[PDB]
Amino acid sequence: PRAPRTYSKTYSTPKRPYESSRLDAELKLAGEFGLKNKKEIYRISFQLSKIRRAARDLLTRDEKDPKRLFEGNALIRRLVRVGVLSEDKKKLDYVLALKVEDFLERRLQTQVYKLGLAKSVHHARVLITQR
Amino acid sequence: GISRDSRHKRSATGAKRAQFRKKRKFELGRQPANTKIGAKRIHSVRTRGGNKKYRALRIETGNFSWASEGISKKTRIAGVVYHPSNNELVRTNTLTKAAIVQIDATPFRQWFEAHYGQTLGKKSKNAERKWAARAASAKIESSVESQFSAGRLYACISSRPGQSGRCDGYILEGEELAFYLRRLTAKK
Amino acid sequence: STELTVQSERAFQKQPHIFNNPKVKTSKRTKRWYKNAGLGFKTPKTAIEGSYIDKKCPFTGLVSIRGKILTGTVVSTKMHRTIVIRRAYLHYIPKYNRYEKRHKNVPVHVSPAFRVQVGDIVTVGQCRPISKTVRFNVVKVSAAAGKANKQFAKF
Amino acid sequence: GFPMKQGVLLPTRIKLLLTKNVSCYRPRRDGERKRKSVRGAIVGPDLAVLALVIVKKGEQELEGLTDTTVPKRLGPKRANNIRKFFGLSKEDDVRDFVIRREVTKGEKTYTKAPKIQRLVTPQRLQRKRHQRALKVRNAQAQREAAAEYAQLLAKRLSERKAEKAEI
Amino acid sequence: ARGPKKHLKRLAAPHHWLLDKLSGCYAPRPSAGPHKLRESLPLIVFLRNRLKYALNGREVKAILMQRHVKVDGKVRTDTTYPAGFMDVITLDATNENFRLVYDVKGRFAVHRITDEEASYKLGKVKKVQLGKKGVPYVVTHDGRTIRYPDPNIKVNDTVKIDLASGKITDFIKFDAGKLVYVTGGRNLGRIGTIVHKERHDGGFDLVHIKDSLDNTFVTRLNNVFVIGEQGKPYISLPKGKGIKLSIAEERDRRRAQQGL
RNA sequence: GCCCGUCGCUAGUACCGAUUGAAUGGCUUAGUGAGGCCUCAGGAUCUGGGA
RNA sequence: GGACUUUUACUUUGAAAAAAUUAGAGUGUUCAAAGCAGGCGUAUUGCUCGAAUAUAUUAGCAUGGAAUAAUAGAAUAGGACG
RNA sequence: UAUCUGGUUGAUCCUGCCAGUAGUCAUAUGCUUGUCUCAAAGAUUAAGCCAUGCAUGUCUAAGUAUAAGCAAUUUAUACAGUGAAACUGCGAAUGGCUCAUUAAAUCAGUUAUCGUUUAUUUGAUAGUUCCUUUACUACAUGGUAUAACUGUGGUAAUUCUAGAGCUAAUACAUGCUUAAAAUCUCGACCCUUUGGAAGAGAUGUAUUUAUUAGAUAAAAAAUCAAUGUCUUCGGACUCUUUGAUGAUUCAUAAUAACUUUUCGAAUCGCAUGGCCUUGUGCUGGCGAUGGUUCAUUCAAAUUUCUGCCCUAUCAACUUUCGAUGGUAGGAUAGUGGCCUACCAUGGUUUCAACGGGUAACGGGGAAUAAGGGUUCGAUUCCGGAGAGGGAGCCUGAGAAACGGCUACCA
Ligand SMILES: [Mg+2]
Ligand SMILES: [Mg+2]
Ligand SMILES: [Mg+2]
Ligand SMILES: [Mg+2]
Ligand SMILES: [Mg+2]
Ligand SMILES: [Mg+2]
Ligand SMILES: [Mg+2]
Ligand SMILES: [Mg+2]
Ligand SMILES: [Mg+2]
Ligand SMILES: [Mg+2]
Ligand SMILES: [Mg+2]
Ligand SMILES: [Mg+2]
Ligand SMILES: [Mg+2]
Ligand SMILES: [Mg+2]
Ligand SMILES: [Mg+2]
Ligand SMILES: [Mg+2]
Ligand SMILES: [Mg+2]
Ligand SMILES: [Mg+2]
Ligand SMILES: [Mg+2]
Ligand SMILES: [Mg+2]
Ligand SMILES: [Mg+2]
Ligand SMILES: [Mg+2]
Ligand SMILES: [Mg+2]
Ligand SMILES: [Mg+2]
Ligand SMILES: [Mg+2]
Ligand SMILES: [Mg+2]
Ligand SMILES: [Mg+2]
Ligand SMILES: [Mg+2]
Ligand SMILES: [Mg+2]
Ligand SMILES: [Mg+2]
Ligand SMILES: [Mg+2]
Ligand SMILES: [Mg+2]
Ligand SMILES: [Mg+2]
Ligand SMILES: [Mg+2]
Ligand SMILES: [Mg+2]
Ligand SMILES: [Mg+2]
């Protein structure tokens, strides 16, 4: 009788299961940003996929439609916030661009590597996971 | 119990309908009072939500009014003589709404001869005054005046005895008296 | 439907509580009651002129009209004092993104204030349940007779 | 063990539907009737006991019967019932005649009398007085509120005859 | 379902209460009273969820059984008493008066009001009839029977009331151009004058509304509560005066007030 | 080269079939008909016609 | 207030509307799924932003349009206005 | 978030399916398993069966205390604290569980009650009770009969109870009361009129019946039968009052009666004050419980428009023993073939009636991501239905109730 506890899942798994290419392209990413799954890359491209979908859907309404200005502007300010989207390309046909790497680059595991503090991406992974 | 639901009972297309739910009590019916003439006997019945209907099983008086004379009296009810729903009501002298009864007259007589000072059929001061006042207003009506001779007046029960324990009516008059008289003889 | 007699029943027919004092010699015999159903519907003169009885007349009886006002086409008049209209209408199946012809018949009471024949478009009004099926009452004829008299003999 | 039930007649057992206010049955719930076995009202050899009531004494005392008396438990408590267990007139002040029952508390002999009921008192008179007074005061109230309207109405008509001679 | 329902699961609860999903499974079913179930703010909700005064529900009973809180003047104990639009909640301790009156989002706001104004309410007369002894009477949206009103007083008009005593001390008719509060629909809490009414004989009269921002909108009549003249409201309003800003207009206000 | 049918072996499915074959479920005629409710009587007892 | 109105389809806008769900704004639950919180200070007797928005169509209601597609009309004139 | 690959041939292009592939709040099972948070879970099969324990009881200053109960003290010789038992009151009709039945049924959205019932909460609401009306009615307050208890008992056995003796009320059952006034009926007398008059009865509300009023579509006149207010005695009538609705025989009120007569406080807690003619007179504070009627609020019941899966190897269906409509009635809370009586012959259907199937509760929704679709919803919210199967009923505001009863079947 208690209200429902809500949940969603947060990843999506490749259509074709043995594309040699996506595989390499995947491994390398985990290799550079110090990831452990293929899921850590699945999650992000899922994240990326819906964001684009919103974008896509917004550009179909004509310019300066309220929802477009509300939700569009919203989506951009929120992206720039965490450092994915360039200050200049800031009008959402580049939120339409936006590869996975841009998202990857902003993890506290990478930040904690990029200004030294760890030296090697994994050392960062460990220090973080170690308080 | 008796049940007034429509969920028995074929559809307009004449289809047959599954039994859906058991009988609820709020769609209940009860049995007829089938009220007769005789020394008074009424039973209350507890209806929905507190509340009472009085089921009259036996009624011998009723308060009947002579509409054109603007009065009512309480008379004995002589009997049932015509019923449009079912002849068996007449035969068994059953009182229901719309039944045609005969009553007593002699309270309506004791009023009329006292009020018009005139006597139906065939010396005070204020009275004489009052009777003189009332005239061109005393001319009764043939078919109704001719009723007092037998001492019995035709009246239509207007109440619902099995509902309220009252058996109440109105003396028959004018065009409506014609109808039922024509029936009472064109059958005799 | 009625037609004729008026006193054709076992019970004497009358309008409830519409007394006529036999003592007062009058010209109209029976005092008659009537009203207008409202909502702008004229009460036809045949209701005020007539002497028919009907306790299910919306102008001379004890019903009220409140709720759906619908119109339909008359398709049966074999019942005495009540009819059946057909209300046709189109129904939108999506998926195929078009419509199909549907209908329903609707049984409705019909005061002898109106003379209805089959084919007449009629406007009916919502009723307290009047009978087992009937929940509507004819309330204007938006028709006439469908040009029958312009179907006659020969030159 | 099954009890007799007055008036069944029969010298056998049967099973009746018993209701409230009926003998050999204590209903557990409102409007509850339980069907129960009952013994007839005619004495048979199958009886374990016979309940008996003396109505005329004989020519000798029965040991623990005639010879001994056991006192009534409770005394009168409703005002008038005290009045009539001493035959007293509405004059003799029941307050004295209410029964008194001693009882000792180790070394305290204590006393406790009923709470006499339906006794007329200063208090109940103050409440019968207030009733009547209030009925009227309201009645007066209503009238004063009534005509105070009638006016509002009358000097509206005395404005619709200043609106009809104006225009 | 054999008798009157006595419980109220959450989720089934009216949303303008702002009750939260978890932390339970039931919401305090509003008592029987002077306001419809789905348009009330039970004491338990206002004394705890709005005013943050009590923590437990248990404390709300304990706060209340001090004859502390009192609605429209009478004292009121019912934990789940149905309080509603135009009423006057009052705390003698903490010398505090409140009117119940709507937000713009659609909710009952917290609304401090003066002692002076705390002594009189407004009621939409919802019907007027003849009673026994030919005594006419009006009844108002908060279940108030008031005998002997003005003849001029007809239905949909609004009424000022002594609370302290029983009576009507002024009234306001329903005319084109009259300050109007909106109690229902997606236009609940908005306020604006009245352009005109659409008749529609036998089925929902309509009411066109124009606010002090030159925006126009309709709500079914019944949903309209007249409350004064353009300018003069016969009661103190809440901030924002029921004018409804677009999500954008608000986003810009909300982050205009941004520089600490 | 391909390939058709009868006839023969193993295994499986479904059909037909004496048994007026069998089983479960839903309605249902006719006959019998509990029990509460209503109703005509009844009067164990227990009082002022009633219970 | 009276006296009377040929029928429809379509389409626009709007009312009347349950919440959770979905889409989606706001808020850094340490992240996230979530949650509807929270955020400022004189952190010793308080200040404060919130708890949006959308979709909710078939039907019924309400309003704009009068293309497209039906319907009805005056020919034995029992036509229309006065 | 618009993708295809493998398999027929010697090779080729097709058609076309099998296979692969990915998801699933989609179940099971195998193997493996460390941390945080979150948290479904005897639906599917058998709405099969159930050992045992628990799931419904409840007291304020404020209905009832002689516990032969506890307590002492603090005025309390009627009662006074506290309080088992028990009476009384209210609740047990909510909740929770399940998805068997159910296909125009439920259910949704949308309607209707001018077609009804409604504990309670909230707001209004009651001077009328008796009697042929001076030797007079308990109202300073009228009746008993009951539990608990006491004591005698019965049965292997139960939330079994019998006989005897007590005693309470907001249980039961009775039964008084109050202003002024007007208007109606009757009318002893007197006197002739143009006619008037003491003074007598009746008039709370509710019930049942009949008769009225409840105007309004813009304005005027004569006459009959009655008969109202003021005479400058031919006459005049002059101001003359009216609620709501789209709509009514609505709200309301009036007349004549009716009733095994509805309600109109025989109740309780705190405080104790005024007021003289010192009657323990007569007054009087705060607020509880009640109480009719109306409203409101929580409801309920019926109900309008449209909308359901597969099926013609279901084409005609419906009235026996109501099928469709009319009149009357009876029954209901109330409409209504809901039932009866009389009468008629209707009602539905290829725009799919009627019948069959559903491994069918309906919705909110769920899964699958170009779109269009496809499939799923026993199951956290709403509605409905059920309590082993049927039926029947008591109590009550509300049950056709099942942790109520009665009967049959298992
Ligand atoms: Mg016929
Ligand atoms: Mg007492
Ligand atoms: Mg339930
Ligand atoms: Mg509550
Ligand atoms: Mg309406
Ligand atoms: Mg055999
Ligand atoms: Mg009978
Ligand atoms: Mg729309
Ligand atoms: Mg929302
Ligand atoms: Mg091959
Ligand atoms: Mg090959
Ligand atoms: Mg080769
Ligand atoms: Mg496959
Ligand atoms: Mg389950
Ligand atoms: Mg099961
Ligand atoms: Mg004691
Ligand atoms: Mg007795
Ligand atoms: Mg009582
Ligand atoms: Mg007139
Ligand atoms: Mg009027
Ligand atoms: Mg009436
Ligand atoms: Mg004193
Ligand atoms: Mg078949
Ligand atoms: Mg009939
Ligand atoms: Mg036939
Ligand atoms: Mg077909
Ligand atoms: Mg099923
Ligand atoms: Mg479901
Ligand atoms: Mg389905
Ligand atoms: Mg199942
Ligand atoms: Mg049930
Ligand atoms: Mg079972
Ligand atoms: Mg059976
Ligand atoms: Mg049952
Ligand atoms: Mg159980
Ligand atoms: Mg139960």
PDB file of C-alpha atoms in Angstrom, chain E residues 5 41 55 79 81 90 99 102 116 139 156 170 173 189 200 226 260:
ATOM      1  CA  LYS E   5     -14.769   4.955   3.629  1.00  0.00           C
ATOM      2  CA  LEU E  41      -6.359  21.675   4.601  1.00  0.00           C
ATOM      3  CA  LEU E  55       6.779  17.272  14.435  1.00  0.00           C
ATOM      4  CA  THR E  79      -7.043  16.564  14.330  1.00  0.00           C
ATOM      5  CA  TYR E  81     -10.881  18.976  10.774  1.00  0.00           C
ATOM      6  CA  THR E  90      -5.787  31.486  14.928  1.00  0.00           C
ATOM      7  CA  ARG E  99      -6.606  33.248   6.521  1.00  0.00           C
ATOM      8  CA  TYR E 102      -4.908  30.159  -2.407  1.00  0.00           C
ATOM      9  CA  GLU E 116      -8.479  43.341  12.938  1.00  0.00           C
ATOM     10  CA  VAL E 139     -26.187  29.309   2.664  1.00  0.00           C
ATOM     11  CA  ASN E 156     -22.960  33.726  -6.628  1.00  0.00           C
ATOM     12  CA  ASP E 170     -22.133  43.687   3.831  1.00  0.00           C
ATOM     13  CA  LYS E 173     -23.029  41.283  -6.330  1.00  0.00           C
ATOM     14  CA  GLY E 189      -5.541  30.994  -7.329  1.00  0.00           C
ATOM     15  CA  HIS E 200     -25.741  28.381 -21.650  1.00  0.00           C
ATOM     16  CA  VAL E 226     -16.295  37.416  -6.303  1.00  0.00           C
ATOM     17  CA  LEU E 260      23.799  37.707  -2.123  1.00  0.00           C
TER      18      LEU E 260
END
